[PDB]
Design an enzyme around this catalytic site. Structure first.
Site, PDB file in Angstrom:
ATOM      1  N   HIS B  25       0.692  -1.233   0.191  1.00 41.12           N
ATOM      2  CA  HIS B  25      -0.062  -0.050  -0.147  1.00 41.12           C
ATOM      3  C   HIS B  25       0.992   1.192   0.196  1.00 41.12           C
ATOM      4  CE1 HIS B  25      -2.271  -3.361   1.851  1.00 41.12           C
ATOM      5  NE2 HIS B  25      -3.572  -2.400   1.263  1.00 41.12           N
ATOM      6  N   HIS B 259      -4.291   3.610  -3.385  1.00 41.54           N
ATOM      7  CA  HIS B 259      -4.248   2.842  -1.996  1.00 41.54           C
ATOM      8  C   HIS B 259      -3.603   1.798  -1.853  1.00 41.54           C
ATOM      9  CE1 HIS B 259      -6.122   0.698   1.392  1.00 41.54           C
ATOM     10  NE2 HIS B 259      -6.380  -0.175   0.707  1.00 41.54           N
ATOM     11  N   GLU B 413     -18.664  -3.262  24.260  1.00 41.16           N
ATOM     12  CA  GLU B 413     -17.675  -4.337  24.437  1.00 41.16           C
ATOM     13  C   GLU B 413     -16.401  -4.369  23.486  1.00 41.16           C
ATOM     14  OE1 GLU B 413     -21.083  -4.679  23.539  1.00 41.16           O
ATOM     15  OE2 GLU B 413     -21.958  -5.236  25.378  1.00 41.16           O
ATOM     16  N   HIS B 476     -29.328 -14.226  24.386  1.00 37.56           N
ATOM     17  CA  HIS B 476     -28.396 -13.930  25.622  1.00 37.56           C
ATOM     18  C   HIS B 476     -27.354 -15.173  25.984  1.00 37.56           C
ATOM     19  CE1 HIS B 476     -30.323 -10.107  25.926  1.00 37.56           C
ATOM     20  NE2 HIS B 476     -29.612  -9.786  27.069  1.00 37.56           N
TER      21      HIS B 476
HETATM   22  C1  8EL Z   1     -26.005  -3.273  29.256  1.00 36.83           C
HETATM   23  C2  8EL Z   1     -27.382  -3.989  29.121  1.00 36.83           C
HETATM   24  C3  8EL Z   1     -28.430  -3.027  29.196  1.00 36.83           C
HETATM   25  C4  8EL Z   1     -28.480  -1.513  29.470  1.00 36.83           C
HETATM   26  C5  8EL Z   1     -29.220  -0.632  28.535  1.00 36.83           C
HETATM   27  O1  8EL Z   1     -29.350   0.440  29.458  1.00 36.83           O
HETATM   28  P1  8EL Z   1     -30.310   1.605  28.683  1.00 36.83           P
HETATM   29  O2  8EL Z   1     -30.421   1.253  27.011  1.00 36.83           O
HETATM   30  O3  8EL Z   1     -30.019   3.009  28.981  1.00 36.83           O
HETATM   31  O4  8EL Z   1     -31.774   1.150  28.982  1.00 36.83           O
HETATM   32  P2  8EL Z   1     -32.672   1.589  30.122  1.00 36.83           P
HETATM   33  O5  8EL Z   1     -33.024   2.877  30.006  1.00 36.83           O
HETATM   34  O6  8EL Z   1     -31.735   1.702  31.452  1.00 36.83           O
HETATM   35  O7  8EL Z   1     -33.742   0.464  30.477  1.00 36.83           O
HETATM   36  S1  8EL Z   1     -29.871  -3.810  29.036  1.00 36.83           S
HETATM   37  C6  8EL Z   1     -28.916  -5.314  29.064  1.00 36.83           C
HETATM   38  N1  8EL Z   1     -27.464  -5.072  28.750  1.00 36.83           N
HETATM   39  C7  8EL Z   1     -26.578  -5.989  28.598  1.00 36.83           C
HETATM   40  C8  8EL Z   1     -26.419  -5.937  27.153  1.00 36.83           C
HETATM   41  C9  8EL Z   1     -25.045  -5.686  26.593  1.00 36.83           C
HETATM   42  N2  8EL Z   1     -24.413  -5.676  25.532  1.00 36.83           N
HETATM   43  C10 8EL Z   1     -25.379  -5.912  24.482  1.00 36.83           C
HETATM   44  C11 8EL Z   1     -24.655  -6.228  23.184  1.00 36.83           C
HETATM   45  N3  8EL Z   1     -26.512  -6.242  24.576  1.00 36.83           N
HETATM   46  C12 8EL Z   1     -27.011  -6.384  25.773  1.00 36.83           C
HETATM   47  N4  8EL Z   1     -28.284  -6.603  26.228  1.00 36.83           N
HETATM   48  C1  8EL Z   2     -11.547  -1.586   3.639  1.00 32.70           C
HETATM   49  C2  8EL Z   2      -9.883  -1.813   3.841  1.00 32.70           C
HETATM   50  C3  8EL Z   2      -9.296  -0.602   3.611  1.00 32.70           C
HETATM   51  C4  8EL Z   2      -9.732   0.628   3.293  1.00 32.70           C
HETATM   52  C5  8EL Z   2      -9.233   1.697   4.135  1.00 32.70           C
HETATM   53  O1  8EL Z   2      -9.603   3.187   3.536  1.00 32.70           O
HETATM   54  P1  8EL Z   2      -8.726   4.010   4.218  1.00 32.70           P
HETATM   55  O2  8EL Z   2      -8.752   3.899   5.424  1.00 32.70           O
HETATM   56  O3  8EL Z   2      -9.354   5.501   3.536  1.00 32.70           O
HETATM   57  O4  8EL Z   2      -7.214   4.093   3.481  1.00 32.70           O
HETATM   58  P2  8EL Z   2      -6.519   4.670   2.256  1.00 32.70           P
HETATM   59  O5  8EL Z   2      -6.528   6.391   2.542  1.00 32.70           O
HETATM   60  O6  8EL Z   2      -7.250   4.607   1.159  1.00 32.70           O
HETATM   61  O7  8EL Z   2      -5.286   4.302   2.226  1.00 32.70           O
HETATM   62  S1  8EL Z   2      -7.671  -1.198   3.922  1.00 32.70           S
HETATM   63  C6  8EL Z   2      -7.916  -2.589   4.067  1.00 32.70           C
HETATM   64  N1  8EL Z   2      -9.358  -2.736   4.368  1.00 32.70           N
HETATM   65  C7  8EL Z   2      -9.960  -3.997   4.477  1.00 32.70           C
HETATM   66  C8  8EL Z   2     -10.332  -4.220   5.858  1.00 32.70           C
HETATM   67  C9  8EL Z   2     -11.779  -4.114   6.200  1.00 32.70           C
HETATM   68  N2  8EL Z   2     -12.259  -4.223   7.493  1.00 32.70           N
HETATM   69  C10 8EL Z   2     -11.390  -4.388   8.464  1.00 32.70           C
HETATM   70  C11 8EL Z   2     -12.004  -4.385   9.860  1.00 32.70           C
HETATM   71  N3  8EL Z   2     -10.211  -4.047   8.349  1.00 32.70           N
HETATM   72  C12 8EL Z   2      -9.570  -4.073   6.973  1.00 32.70           C
HETATM   73  N4  8EL Z   2      -8.382  -3.956   6.884  1.00 32.70           N
HETATM   74  O1  F6R Z   3     -29.147  -7.775  28.970  1.00 34.82           O
HETATM   75  C1  F6R Z   3     -29.838  -7.202  29.612  1.00 34.82           C
HETATM   76  C2  F6R Z   3     -31.367  -6.966  28.867  1.00 34.82           C
HETATM   77  O2  F6R Z   3     -31.059  -7.004  27.499  1.00 34.82           O
HETATM   78  C3  F6R Z   3     -29.542  -6.787  31.317  1.00 34.82           C
HETATM   79  O3  F6R Z   3     -30.773  -5.776  31.559  1.00 34.82           O
HETATM   80  C4  F6R Z   3     -29.816  -8.172  31.839  1.00 34.82           C
HETATM   81  O4  F6R Z   3     -31.199  -8.752  31.577  1.00 34.82           O
HETATM   82  C5  F6R Z   3     -29.455  -7.854  33.198  1.00 34.82           C
HETATM   83  O5  F6R Z   3     -28.381  -7.304  33.501  1.00 34.82           O
HETATM   84  C6  F6R Z   3     -29.516  -9.453  34.030  1.00 34.82           C
HETATM   85  O6  F6R Z   3     -29.480  -9.326  35.505  1.00 34.82           O
HETATM   86  P1  F6R Z   3     -29.029 -10.551  36.374  1.00 34.82           P
HETATM   87  O7  F6R Z   3     -28.845 -11.687  35.274  1.00 34.82           O
HETATM   88  O8  F6R Z   3     -27.717  -9.806  37.006  1.00 34.82           O
HETATM   89  O9  F6R Z   3     -30.327 -10.493  37.169  1.00 34.82           O
HETATM   90  O1  F6R Z   4      -7.366  -5.282   4.041  1.00 36.75           O
HETATM   91  C1  F6R Z   4      -6.666  -4.350   3.496  1.00 36.75           C
HETATM   92  C2  F6R Z   4      -5.503  -3.481   4.151  1.00 36.75           C
HETATM   93  O2  F6R Z   4      -5.369  -3.326   5.379  1.00 36.75           O
HETATM   94  C3  F6R Z   4      -6.936  -4.048   1.947  1.00 36.75           C
HETATM   95  O3  F6R Z   4      -6.265  -2.972   1.356  1.00 36.75           O
HETATM   96  C4  F6R Z   4      -6.430  -5.330   1.394  1.00 36.75           C
HETATM   97  O4  F6R Z   4      -5.122  -5.457   1.472  1.00 36.75           O
HETATM   98  C5  F6R Z   4      -6.851  -5.247  -0.251  1.00 36.75           C
HETATM   99  O5  F6R Z   4      -8.031  -5.025  -0.547  1.00 36.75           O
HETATM  100  C6  F6R Z   4      -6.448  -6.752  -0.874  1.00 36.75           C
HETATM  101  O6  F6R Z   4      -6.512  -6.598  -2.081  1.00 36.75           O
HETATM  102  P1  F6R Z   4      -6.456  -8.031  -3.287  1.00 36.75           P
HETATM  103  O7  F6R Z   4      -6.224  -9.019  -2.217  1.00 36.75           O
HETATM  104  O8  F6R Z   4      -7.749  -7.580  -3.764  1.00 36.75           O
HETATM  105  O9  F6R Z   4      -5.323  -7.645  -4.245  1.00 36.75           O
END
Ligand code: 8EL
Ligand code: 8EL
Ligand code: F6R
Ligand code: F6R
Ligand code: CA
Ligand code: CA
Lengths: 675, 675
Positions: B25, B259, B413, B476
């Site tokens: 690249h 690129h 996460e 879950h």
């Molecule tokens: C953190 C968590 C929650 C809080 C929501 O907080 P919120 O959106 O502000 O909801 P609220 O207004 O408080 O009822 S639910 C359950 N979950 C665990 C949870 C964590 N990660 C993912 C991907 N999905 C989930 N389900």
């Molecule tokens: C899409 C892709 C790229 C474009 C970057 O585009 P950009 O950030 O704007 O870079 P640039 O200015 O053009 O050189 S690289 C390689 N990749 C595939 C690629 C896809 N997804 C993840 C998670 N990692 C990667 N590596």
């Molecule tokens: O993932 C969610 C809902 O989408 C959380 O609200 C969980 O339901 C909660 O944290 C579980 O609680 P306990 O298992 O600790 O009782």
């Molecule tokens: O993931 C990236 C770099 O992090 C892309 O730039 C790939 O390197 C490219 O798309 C591979 O290209 P070809 O395998 O199609 O030659």
């Protein structure tokens, strides 16, 4: 008023459901009941026809709040009753702890994993725009529906929703209307502890329109007005900020404690008496509320009745488009569409399976209008765009049109996965796909798992499947990825070896109605195999080379099938007779009859698997496994294969060792088991 | 000027490296060379001591641009030479196609998967703030370093970077300085096709400071000034917008074609002649450039020399803190720290392993200062915070202080996973952890895989491991998750059964120096086992119940060990004698001696595995597998176990069938293999 009584009814149904289960989430249902009431009054839907293609869609992205959704569905007379609410969160009920589209009438998608539903809503809205651009004509608004999404703070923290929101703003999706439950409380307490960004400023930066409702605990007039305002802004998705009190009405309102546990019994009593309900009664449904909701249903049913007449008139005015639309609404592909799939012979040139995939798409996209798809910024590497197609873009950009077929997802794998789920959820037989490198499908695991659980026929075009990609190195080379997805229930993971197998993989992916597909495709060229066909590959696993006096059978996939065939020749020189099995999809194979499967993997012969990635799962089909259980390397691909002994001689050596290991032993098929 | 000559040298080294490999690249290296020159001139680092704890850190988040990084490292006299550049992208070289911290001197982290490096930079900066708050004293700036990150458009599209950027703004991380390569070109072409958001407005919404450099193709004065400006803003991370031309200088500058593929040979000739280099020469390093760079190195080495004297003076002034700091820089835990691990007997009460984990953390955090960690908005569910600790927050918020030990990651996460990698990368023996539900570790798979590849000792506290969580239901409940991570090289996946095993899991996780850990922990209570100990569980797998005349051995993990012990009693009533093996970590077990492993899984006896999730991988250790290969259910957990026959009677039935299946057969250990 009756509207106030309806809101109280919703709130109390939700709280009583949580109480009966002694499990679940009362806070957000209490806070969002006014908004839910207002939005459902604006929505067009038929509780007796959940699949009406011109319905407005609702998505509860904050799926933990599902007691609210279930209460709405019950009040509106979907196929869900108060008796089902009493069984909230109970084994086998129609009211699971998070909504499941396979189980719950009126649940468009499966939510609960935060961030997903808003992305699904983006996909429903993308599909609606594409569908309307394809079918609408003057005086024929076949599709003009909206997509309403509820979401919370947690959804707004998850990166997948940022990806989808950036893209939705770019795509000018004016029929998307999302509502943020701005209650300032998550599980860890105040949003001041971790979430202090200016959400509204961020959404403006994406090109969304904003409406703020400062008193969403009571002001349903303002919520309705916000929807009207959003409908006037036809070139931007809208975010409606609903400032609410979590657990509104509870003694514990405005606290994290009401997010996720049942209310105290005395709290529920005071809720009921403050709102004019009997504190001794649970699951009350005032008849006046039912009457009010029934009136809206009856009006919506008259709207659908008129739509059915519009559709009949459309079929007269536009006979070909009308027949196409009818076929799609019946869930049927074009008759004999699969005659467009390319077929190869062993005399044809070697081709990478990414390029074979390009060729398939080029043949089938013109024949099957319900295929749309895109790539996560890898279009020239995944080879996912058919020449002569236009991109899905708002026409205002000059870069495409909503009638386009190819989506530029940008570097957004996770949102691509969840948007694909939404496109599938829209219906109308959409068969949609998304390209990236196989190793980066893993970025979208949250959504992929939901494709499987939701039974959506989406397809990942997952190129650069192995160390065969070469120089980009171990950060790009899959090891664990196929084991991960094969271990997930209900994912077809095709790893085609050649042209005929690639056509079989697409036949499966496009015909699918309930199973997502991942197509693991090569960067590097592979030969056309002697013995392959669409017919045989469609069985998922098949005998490529039959050897009646086999000392060993080699089972392989993808790029390793040709390797196995070359090893067979080395083995012949060592006095060992081998057969070869190609296993392009383990799930499809598993679904074949026991007798078919045993014809492929018989008793009485050792079986060696060969696949240049994890050996996990392979013992289902083999006695010994030759795989790659370490990370890869940055170098020219053939040199990496040589380093790891994925060569005809390396495979032959391990095959010969396998034959020797089973000398004097009784061998039964790996398909046999004790239970 | 010499600065101009240095920039040209960097550009041409990068292009010549790509040319030699005929892979890689050149575009972003050409565009970012002025910025790289300017930033490295501001950085404090020692090429001869890559681990100096007060160095500034640099992260190339756009890892595909690594020919640029390698050129900088070579020019500054790291342990990387022009001969290594000539081997760019060649098997076994020190110059892989994306940077790897295990392989490349001066690569802080492993990048290439887009979005990761900026998050890693957030973690390095978080660690630096925590470290400085812990150790700095008046007249003793032990830690005062900066974190510089380069990133591109692709990084800004990936949701993980939004998560980390929101959090970094919240955390007021003023020593983080990121640089956006604003070149408007990605693989699919113009960013107008998919990425039209107002990036700067979004970063302002997160609480970042912004500096814009409109002519970053040439204006190194402005880039240096931007760094000075960023250093004055002590309570906000800074984003520097570098408006560049991708491939600057190439005939093909400003196009997607530059690129990701090598330049044409005639293009390289004109580059050289326009910049005063010999078009017949490759890998030129003008001695004046070397001299200029050497002067900066010599100055930096004098700065480190002075820091070493500051550290010696610190140890005199602050004897206890100084000894603690020394121990950490030596990579050593406190002597006999593990005496704080809780120990249990079979007389003790049943406890959920999430609660046992809480108790461990409560005992060890006060004893081991280099432990910090947090949760992704699941603190009261994961049980990850020790009572009496303060949160890591800027003191200005009133919600914590930078000396705090507990991080409120929010619902993020993936960024949590990548931030943990950055905290580990900082060094100083940090042993850091992150809590979520096991099913949502999958949201962070991109980062988790990089923990493994990068050999970082991070720990996931992954509670709610199975259908044992109950009512939240199949969205879950993990099925595939442990198979996925066990199939990834270099991940220790502990699934402890009881108190002693949970202590062994933490002993492993905290002692780790090169292997990430995932601790799969229960919602539900489990009994203390007869036969468990830290000593035996530390072997990864051990004989829990020895039976010299066993008809069968049951191997199990986690919640299923107690189930196996109960099944043994049912089997005794059927006249079948069973042994039980507990396998709390397959990776640790695999690393034991062959003879130890065979003592646990001997020849001559059928072996049945029991674990309430995918059966993938289990054939390594068993002849037959009882697992759960379908999605779960929403209901009370004991009812779900009963539905799926994970009961003493269900296990016994399958054990008896296993014994019958092997009657008259010769059985050897699953540990045996042909090769
Ligand atoms: C953190 C968590 C929650 C809080 C929501 O907080 P919120 O959106 O502000 O909801 P609220 O207004 O408080 O009822 S639910 C359950 N979950 C665990 C949870 C964590 N990660 C993912 C991907 N999905 C989930 N389900
Ligand atoms: C899409 C892709 C790229 C474009 C970057 O585009 P950009 O950030 O704007 O870079 P640039 O200015 O053009 O050189 S690289 C390689 N990749 C595939 C690629 C896809 N997804 C993840 C998670 N990692 C990667 N590596
Ligand atoms: O993932 C969610 C809902 O989408 C959380 O609200 C969980 O339901 C909660 O944290 C579980 O609680 P306990 O298992 O600790 O009782
Ligand atoms: O993931 C990236 C770099 O992090 C892309 O730039 C790939 O390197 C490219 O798309 C591979 O290209 P070809 O395998 O199609 O030659
Ligand atoms: Ca909230
Ligand atoms: Ca770019």
């Amino acid at each position: 008023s009756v509207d106030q009584k309806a809101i109280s009814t919703i709130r109390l149904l939700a709280v009583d459901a949580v109480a009966a289960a002694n499990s679940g989430h009362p806070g957000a249902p209490l806070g969002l009941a006014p908004a839910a009431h207002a939005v459902f009054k604006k929505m067009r839907f038929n509780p007796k026809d959940t699949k009406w293609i011109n319905r407005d869609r609702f998505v509860l992205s904050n799926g933990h709040a599902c007691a609210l959704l279930y209460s709405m569905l019950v009040l509106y007379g979907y196929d869900l009753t108060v008796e089902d609410l009493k069984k909230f969160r109970q084994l086998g009920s129609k009211t699971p702890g998070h909504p499941e589209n396979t189980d719950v009438p009126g649940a468009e998608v499966t939510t609960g994993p935060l961030g997903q539903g808003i992305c699904n809503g983006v996909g429903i809205a993308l599909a609606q725009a594409q569908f309307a651009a394809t079918y609408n004509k003057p005086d024929f608004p076949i599709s003009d529906s909206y997509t309403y999404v509820f979401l919370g703070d947690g959804c707004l923290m998850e990166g997948v929703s940022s990806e989808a929101s950036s893209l939705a703003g770019h795509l000018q999706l004016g029929n998307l209307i999302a509502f943020w439950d701005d209650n300032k409380i998550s599980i860890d307490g105040s949003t001041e502890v971790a979430f202090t960004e200016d959400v509204i400023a961020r959404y403006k930066s994406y090109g969304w329109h904003i409406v703020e409702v400062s008193d969403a605990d009571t002001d349903i007039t303002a919520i309705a007005a916000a929807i009207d305002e959003a409908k006037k802004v036809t070139n931007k998705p809208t975010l409606v900020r609903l400032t609410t009190t979590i657990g509104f009405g509870s003694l514990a309102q405005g606290t994290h404690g009401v997010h996720g546990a049942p209310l105290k019994a005395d709290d529920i009593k005071q809720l009921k008496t403050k709102w004019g309900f009997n504190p001794e009664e649970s699951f009350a449904v005032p008849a006046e509320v039912t009457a009010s909701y029934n009136e809206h249903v009856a009006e919506n049913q008259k709207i659908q009745q008129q739509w059915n007449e519009l559709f009949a008139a459309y079929k007269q005015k536009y006979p070909e488009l009308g027949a196409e639309l009818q076929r799609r609404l019946d869930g049927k592909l074009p008759e004999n569409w699969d005659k467009a799939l390319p077929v190869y012979t062993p005399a044809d040139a070697a081709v990478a399976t990414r390029k074979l995939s390009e060729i398939v798409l080029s043949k089938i996209i013109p024949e099957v209008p319900e295929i749309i798809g895109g790539s996560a910024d890898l279009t020239p590497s995944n080879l996912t765009k058919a020449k002569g197609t236009v991109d899905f873009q708002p026409a205002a950009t000059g870069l495409g049109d909503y009638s386009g077929r190819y989506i530029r997802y940008g570097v957004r794998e996770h949102a691509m996965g969840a948007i694909m789920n939404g496109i599938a959820a829209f219906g109308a037989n959409y068969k949609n796909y998304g390209g990236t490198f196989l190793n980066f499908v893993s970025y979208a695991a949250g959504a992929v798992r939901l494709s499987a659980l939701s039974e959506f026929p989406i397809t990942w075009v997952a190129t650069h499947d192995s160390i065969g990609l070469g120089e980009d190195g171990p950060t790009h080379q899959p090891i664990e990825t196929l084991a991960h997805f094969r271990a997930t229930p209900n994912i077809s993971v095709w790893r085609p070896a050649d042209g005929n197998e690639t056509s079989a993989a697409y036949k499966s992916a496009i015909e699918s109605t309930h199973t997502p597909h991942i197509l693991a495709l090569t960067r590097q060229n592979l030969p056309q195999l002697e013995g392959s066909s669409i017919e045989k590959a469609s069985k998922g696993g098949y005998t490529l080379v039959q050897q009646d006096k086999a000392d060993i059978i080699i089972v392989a996939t993808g790029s390793e099938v040709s390797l196995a065939v070359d090893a067979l020749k080395v083995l012949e020189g060592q006095g060992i007779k081998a057969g070869v099995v190609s296993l392009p999809d383990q799930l499809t194979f598993d679904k074949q009859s026991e007798e078919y499967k045993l014809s492929v993997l018989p008793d009485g012969v050792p079986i060696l698997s060969v696949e240049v990635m994890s050996t996990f799962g392979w013992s289902k089909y083999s006695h010994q496994q030759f795989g790659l259980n370490r990370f890869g390397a940055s170098g020219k691909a053939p040199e990496i294969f040589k380093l790891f002994e994925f060569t005809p001689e390396g495979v032959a050596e391990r095959a010969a060792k396998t034959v020797a290991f089973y000398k004097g032993k009784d061998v039964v098929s790996p398909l046999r088991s004790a239970f």
